[PDB]
Design a binder for these strands. Sequence first.
DNA 1: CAACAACAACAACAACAACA
Lengths: 321, 321, 321, 321, 321, 317, 8, 19, 20, 18, 18, 18
Amino acid sequence: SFGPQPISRLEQCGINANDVKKLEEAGFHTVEAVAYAPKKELINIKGISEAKADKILAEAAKLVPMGFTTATEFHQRRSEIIQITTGSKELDKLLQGGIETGSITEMFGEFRTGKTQICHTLAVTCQLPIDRGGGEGKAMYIDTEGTFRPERLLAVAERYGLSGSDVLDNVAYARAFNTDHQTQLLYQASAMMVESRYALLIVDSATALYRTDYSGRGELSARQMHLARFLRMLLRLADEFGVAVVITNQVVAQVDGAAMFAADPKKPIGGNIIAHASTTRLYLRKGRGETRICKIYDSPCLPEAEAMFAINADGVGDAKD
Amino acid sequence: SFGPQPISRLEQCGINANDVKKLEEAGFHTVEAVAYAPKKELINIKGISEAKADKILAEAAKLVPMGFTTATEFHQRRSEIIQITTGSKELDKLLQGGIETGSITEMFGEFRTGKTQICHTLAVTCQLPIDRGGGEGKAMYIDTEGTFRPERLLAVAERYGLSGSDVLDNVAYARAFNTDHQTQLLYQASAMMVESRYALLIVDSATALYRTDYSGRGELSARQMHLARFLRMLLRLADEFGVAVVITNQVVAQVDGAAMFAADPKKPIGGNIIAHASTTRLYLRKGRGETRICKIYDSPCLPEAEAMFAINADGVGDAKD
Amino acid sequence: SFGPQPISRLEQCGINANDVKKLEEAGFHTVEAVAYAPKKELINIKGISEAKADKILAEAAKLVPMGFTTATEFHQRRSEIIQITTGSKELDKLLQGGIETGSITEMFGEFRTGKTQICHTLAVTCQLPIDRGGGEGKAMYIDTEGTFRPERLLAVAERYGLSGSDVLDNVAYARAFNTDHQTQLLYQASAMMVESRYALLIVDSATALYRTDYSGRGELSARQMHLARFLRMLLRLADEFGVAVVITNQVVAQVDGAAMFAADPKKPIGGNIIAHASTTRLYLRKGRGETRICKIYDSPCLPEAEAMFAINADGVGDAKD
Amino acid sequence: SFGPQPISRLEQCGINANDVKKLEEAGFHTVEAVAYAPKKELINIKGISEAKADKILAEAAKLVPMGFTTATEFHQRRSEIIQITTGSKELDKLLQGGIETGSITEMFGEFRTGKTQICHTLAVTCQLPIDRGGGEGKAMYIDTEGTFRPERLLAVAERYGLSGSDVLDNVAYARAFNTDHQTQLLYQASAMMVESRYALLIVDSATALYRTDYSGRGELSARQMHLARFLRMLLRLADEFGVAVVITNQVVAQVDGAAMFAADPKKPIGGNIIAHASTTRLYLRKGRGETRICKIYDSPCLPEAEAMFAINADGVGDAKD
Amino acid sequence: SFGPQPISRLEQCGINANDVKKLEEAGFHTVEAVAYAPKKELINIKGISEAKADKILAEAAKLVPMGFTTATEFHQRRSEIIQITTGSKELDKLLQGGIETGSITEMFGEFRTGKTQICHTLAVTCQLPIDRGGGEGKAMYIDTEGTFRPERLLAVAERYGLSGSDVLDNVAYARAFNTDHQTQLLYQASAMMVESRYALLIVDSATALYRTDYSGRGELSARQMHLARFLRMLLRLADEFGVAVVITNQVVAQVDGAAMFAADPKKPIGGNIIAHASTTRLYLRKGRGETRICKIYDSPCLPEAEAMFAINADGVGDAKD
Amino acid sequence: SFGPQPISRLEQCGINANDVKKLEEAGFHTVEAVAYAPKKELINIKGISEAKADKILAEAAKLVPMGFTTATEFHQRRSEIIQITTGSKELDKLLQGGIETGSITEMFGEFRTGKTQICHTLAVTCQLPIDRGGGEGKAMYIDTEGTFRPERLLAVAERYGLSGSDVLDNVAYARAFNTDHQTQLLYQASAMMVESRYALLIVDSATALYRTDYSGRGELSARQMHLARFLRMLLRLADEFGVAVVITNQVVAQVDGAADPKKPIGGNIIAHASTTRLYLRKGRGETRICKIYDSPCLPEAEAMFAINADGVGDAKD
Amino acid sequence: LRLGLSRL
Amino acid sequence: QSLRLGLSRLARVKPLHPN
Amino acid sequence: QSLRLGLSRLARVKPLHPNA
Amino acid sequence: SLRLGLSRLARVKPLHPN
Amino acid sequence: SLRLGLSRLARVKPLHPN
Amino acid sequence: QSLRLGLSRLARVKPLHP
DNA sequence: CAACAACAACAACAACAACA
Ligand SMILES: [K+]
Ligand SMILES: [K+]
Ligand SMILES: [K+]
Ligand SMILES: [K+]
Ligand SMILES: [K+]
């Protein structure tokens, strides 16, 4: 019973089935989802009154732990977390295991640094057994740039000894044409995640469409609010299902602000919203030939350091010294 | 009996058990809390009439003195305030002792500044003996972002020579998923604080969830009222138990005027409510490498100055030259 | 007999001592209060009939003059008003002498402007001799936020050449936890200051508790009424002993509409009741470093002019060149 | 039925003709274009309200699937992508088929490298039958420099054994005199692709006019925003009609920030906007005599490699040994 | 009526004469110039608002066709362009007719190669009838070195049989003393060219004054921007009136950016801006005695080759074999 | 009143005296100098704002024509250009009149050639009446080698019959010790020229100090920039005052790959900035040969001249 | 007249 | 309904060049 | 009755892929 | 219509009759 | 008497046995 | 209001050497 | 008749010969 409880449990709790259907249509497919939701969100749903929402909230909270606990229990639970191998030994050593499930990891850098390659390699490796560094689950790919190539997947699957056809079969792909579609896709993501078992969710890239959909200083606040809502939805998914959420970012040039005039200053776009929402941040730089350098920009438990990886014909790996 | 007297003392004044039971159910576990509560709150409570509320208030005022004192007595009592070390000598010199108990300390800055690191250091140093600069009490942690790491606690405990297991056992941890959960955690914290002896209460981040829960201009007033209620509850806890309340704050960009400080001016979020609620305010910024700079933004008795600390594998400390 | 005649000198005017003690426990401690009291509140008391109320009101009006007087005598008496120096030459010039006794001065501004520092400096200055700027009187501090520091009083007393213990023994302190406690503090302060020579009353801040005790439009109106009552009590003090009342106020943004933009406009909270009740109004703004700007907002005898002061380690002083 | 659906189908869905005409005038000539547009883009149209926009989006989402699909289906569909031969065997081997339809290829280099020659050759080779490496369609040429010569088209047609007049009748050429006209031409282009079959859209050059129209600092932000909007419109065209979009870019000299100081380092202009917008990037250099070298600067599925081609009297071809 | 439409056509279209006059002061003397200008160029004119600019642009677009046209029409128009013979049979054979109209031809080389002699010969020959290879129009000469000599013009006119007075009277001459004057001469040139018929404009040399006006690395960006503005204005003139624009350029000795050197390697100055702005580039080299060699450095349609000419007493001609 | 107008004229069209003083301190002495300068130099003067410089330029542009004129006017203006005789009939025929005013003439060759002798002869002959081939003006001599000898001037003056005393008095002399001193001497020369009639200016040599003051490949760019600035100042002087500027140049060997193995020094900066270039060679015995290395209107030809005790003249058989 | 505190 | 990337190779395309 | 911190390696899971 | 340069068949008065 | 927080002179058993 | 190309022979000049 | 602040983005520019 490690997984989340479906909302149909509330059926044997004293809740009308039609109201449960309305909740499901509103986007709450799990008891955890309604439990974590505030009262305003349940009030906003048509056909739900204050008394019904209060009863639903109380009954849902009766089935989930939302109290106080000691720190040793949290340490014990976190010691059993699943970390997905990136495919490169140096990156795994830098991250002390790899990409951590249940949180948000973001990579940023200039072009050709290798963000999409890391996304493809993680999508392939998330289907490996736990003893091999995988998660034994499927993968999601919400792509907003049109750069999904299901031939790198075959190369990595051939490298790891898996069947290419099965690897392609067990990956879900969707394309976002605008910000509204990008945010809408998460509802279907949760609805079809409640059925099967997923371990990785990939957005590449999160902020590509926000540069053009919202342009100018006059549209800054609305863009930031939409981005905050999207990131909150991603965090809700990560908490609900325990998947590892990975998002890709872009960079902009510091024309005059700070950096002491280095070779070429660059900072990630998205502002303080995405700066505070992401749990782990990585900066990717181009090195020599096919080698690139990854640096831990921000992390609550990992020290600032650097690692070297490469993009070989079978995905992300270690540089051939 | 330096600690607050329990509510059961009112039993000796003739008030029946039912009244005490309803008072405890509403969230008044201490006679001091009852005395500090206005008559309107008691009237709101179901099951208490005007005469009952007047009698309860009169008995509470009889128990605890709420009269006029002399400044000499205030100076004598303030000189015996426990201040918790922050792990850095320069920070302690700037703060003239450390984090004060019975007040509200706010910390704000950009990402990577080290608010969470200082929170972990404080939560692990609050258990030191008073002669060593600690607080000789348990730590309380409320997390609204999901960035609580017991490994840092273990590292700093090993630095200070304490045992890891009991240090972890002495820290209570909770996570708030929304604002209502954040507020209910305060009632639970008061209930558990009545029994044991705590010295520190950390909220991080206090205003992280308000950015998303109340989005838009139309919900500004409700957001500010909820934040005011939360801050008043925190002040009530600090007055009742004397524990030191430390809350962290996020930052936003000053795009409207561009200020005059630098090319990236930033200001804390929350507005005048949190500006006036907190007693001491600290502004953290990044320096070079692993070094950070802390500035006293506002303090009733501390002159403006700066300190320079660092984050190492043993927590927050002084810079290594 | 410049001070008010106490309530002990109407028993020889055919008044039973029982009525005198009833008036004393009701809140009236001097014949000035009785002669200036409307008949309706003397009738709403318990234990006094209409005939007794008339017979005491007529004699009280006989003792205390109440009628028309020549303007020349009024000007001559107003020439003899003690003005308490603020410790800054520029502020003294702007205020034309300082804080007027027997009057209400309200100061408002954003955080860290220096209202509490000004209050501390005034409290320590009030004990100076009249010719140096003081009023031979003590000081009282009704604090509702928790920012009372004897250290600042000691520093300014050392600056002015006074003993720390002697200057501390004259300042009475009290903290209010709610609005009812705020009113009871004034009720006790009347009896505290009838028997002793007081020349300063400081409330910091009056409107802090009303912001959270009554929240929302539904409780707004009652809120205002309570505030009015408080202000009326203050006025009675200003006419019962001639003490100068100093109040600090909070500010809020102008989100609804900016009047042709004002670089983050700010308006004082409290409504029109305290705008009409207060006599002098000051606006404090932050400048460069520790220098602050004080501007007259409303005064029936002074033009709207600006002045510059600073907060140094010895309190409020002039700008340091 | 593999082509796009004309907007007139929306009339059969239960939508008036007036709003359909308004949409067509706004530039939406296809149901796919409407489905890919955000709600705020439809709101900006005069005469369209929120309810009408919501109904239009809801009815358009039914006729085109925008949801989740497996990766095997994407692999099967991508195995059938038409690739246009560039006229040289080595370039075809380097690009693994030739220029890919449905994406953006940006070719940049020094002067006289041969990008215009490549565009001229492609404008003829896109009219070949599918089994010969063509696309069986017309071609578009938006020329912003004035360097369009149909004589090269005639030479390539003579080489490939096609009638010169027939080849010339199938090329639509327009000239842009400024950036605003550059963006305006795309609306007529989109309106014209509906009635016929186009396989290639060429912009030469994309950023020639931006160098001069927006000059110096203070116009950089507007220049980049306009460039981003133009590139987004190009991407929308490519997604809507499945055409092969080829854009030509210029270079600038790296004065500071030594890249490697090999021999006159050069950097493509346009910044991170055009760096992230383009899907494939080619770098062209001059070799010896008529031979030039092409290198894969950036590609999501192609290794970094170099190929050699030549500019003969019949267009771009293999070097004559 | 093949010539440009004077700006006096917009007045009888809904535009007041005052706006036409204001546009004329801005340098726009033709409807084509108004049509080709972007909106922000008309906005910068004082006294012209957004609505006025929109109306003017709409009228200009109505009068001037700027749509999509097939390649056959472009081929037909390109087969009827006027090419001016340079005076030498070999040079005309190399250029496939002579100097093209409506484009920019730049000759560069070391000193003494004969750029000025070629310019003088072209200035004389542009006045020939169409049958003899001329353009049947006047010529302009902007000279930035003081090297203009009418004696060569008289000699070439004697060679061609034309009267000297007619040839001299149809040549306009201006001297540029700095960069700003060089740019203002172009505005004066447009003003005087809207009235009469001109076939050829000469700038000699384009980049002479930039080598000395903007000296040093710190002034490189401003120099390049000003050069780009000058070249764009020249291209605007060429597109406006269909004249043949011929500019001359200098050389700079390569030292380290080549690594492979002939006896003395030299490259043109002006950088990528002038490399990209020019349409046809000729490289001039010194032969034996009075013979010189011309090579096609850059041309969209002319294959690279070399031709031999000579400088005789009657200007540029064929060498005496 | 065909000469340049003094800067004081700007006083009469709405400019304060202080602005005129600051312009004079910056090196501008006539209205033409202000007109020929762009906005950058006027901005660079401390105390002059953007609006003031714009006003000054707009005011100065009206006093001198700055527009388009037909080639007939230019031809008729060039038809009365004063040319100074070199002292030799063969060289006069080669140059079609002699050294022209308003342009830059540079002579280069090996040592023991006669460039300084030609400079001395020109300095003497520039004071002759227009009928005999002079310019009826004084002469200036900027010397960077210490080879200025008044005895040659006395000999040539005796040859032409002029008095020695006033010939010596009508020649200004200056010596340049370093590269910056050359530009300072030019700045002083502007103030010397504005107040008197000057016909000929001589620099001998214009590239001697640059060989020693600037050395190595690392200082090539600075040397070329300074040489370009000096040449542009010379061109501005020639355009402003209508003088004949004669500069002298040395040669460098062509030790490179292959090939006369001697070429003028200074590079493209001095090659492109000279209107007329003369190459001088040593012939048999004492007679020397002159060739037109570069000219925009004269063909390549050779002439023979000789240096005798009375200066430069024809070679006796 | 009671106007407050008086110096005299 | 399926998805679309670009022009399909197996599409029924009318002959543009008969020769 | 306890908190969840993502996917747990101690939880049972059927083999997504065949043996290898 | 289109306009590139100067049309060769455009009628124009003779600049130099001679 | 008043209380301003945790008194420094309170006699409380140590949390840690060291 | 002409263009000055140098030193003009026709211009009147005082005799430098009488 | 009162109360309530929020939100970052954007790269551009080549020049310089020398020494038997
Ligand atoms: K973070
Ligand atoms: K505060
Ligand atoms: K890319
Ligand atoms: K070109
Ligand atoms: K020359």
